[PDB]
Ligand binder design. Sequence first.
Ligand SMILES: CN1CCN(C(=O)c2ccc(S(N)(=O)=O)cc2)C[C@@H]1Cc1ccccc1
Ligand SMILES: [Zn+2]
Length: 258
Amino acid sequence: HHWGYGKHNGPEHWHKDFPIAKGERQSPVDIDTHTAKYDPSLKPLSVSYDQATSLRILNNGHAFNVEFDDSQDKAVLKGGPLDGTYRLIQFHFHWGSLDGQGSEHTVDKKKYAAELHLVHWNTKYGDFGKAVQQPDGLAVLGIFLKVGSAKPGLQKVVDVLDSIKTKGKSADFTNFDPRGLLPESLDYWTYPGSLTTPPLLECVTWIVLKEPISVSSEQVLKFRKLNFNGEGEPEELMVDNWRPAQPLKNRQIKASFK
Ligand SMILES: CN1CCN(C(=O)c2ccc(S(N)(=O)=O)cc2)C[C@@H]1Cc1ccccc1
Ligand SMILES: [Zn+2]
């Protein structure tokens, strides 16, 4: 009876195995755009993905992860609110059963069709497993997806999903360039939070881009053909793999822009 996104094991149940679910810096949150304060001391974000080495794509039963070689400073996130150098380890998405839901963060209570999480760890902690034990261990770059025009740099991801339909399937996924998933603007909101899945560790500096990317209805439909289940198990479509907004509590969301 493991955690997931069903009626019996979904987000309202997680606190029983992961009591930090009710903690003081849980993610995601609603971004109230009128209350977020411009912080003119925030620096521009530095996204340095030119030497990124993608390796593999994995259906983990909760989402799919595009994994990178993080054994050197190849694809890194710096600046913005961050002190030091954060290495890209993987990206994944959260999405809905319908275009009107799927994002984890909301903006003035608006839900987007999906949300991309580019996950990075602070190199001062040496490995990802050590970093998630620290309050400044991770930086997750969050990008909203809306349905409209296709995102050409997403199609190589969409086209491999048939090969990883079920939990535990992986596929080679070399030479994928995550720069093709970014919007034009790097304007962002930032706040201290958590992993949005168990173990819900309070180790993330969230950086949420204001500008969503557009994907096509056909691209997101292909996300919704994935399976939560393993091969030869009853089919349960991988949809609505998002945690809803959690209480902001004693936190301030800062804006990089006016
Ligand atoms: C390493 N795994 C397995 C997968 N996972 C994560 O690494 C992770 C990353 C990003 C997010 S998010 N949606 O961007 O906030 C959520 C979870 C969870 C988990 C983390 C973990 C940490 C310590 C002990 C055991 C497991
Ligand atoms: Zn995520």
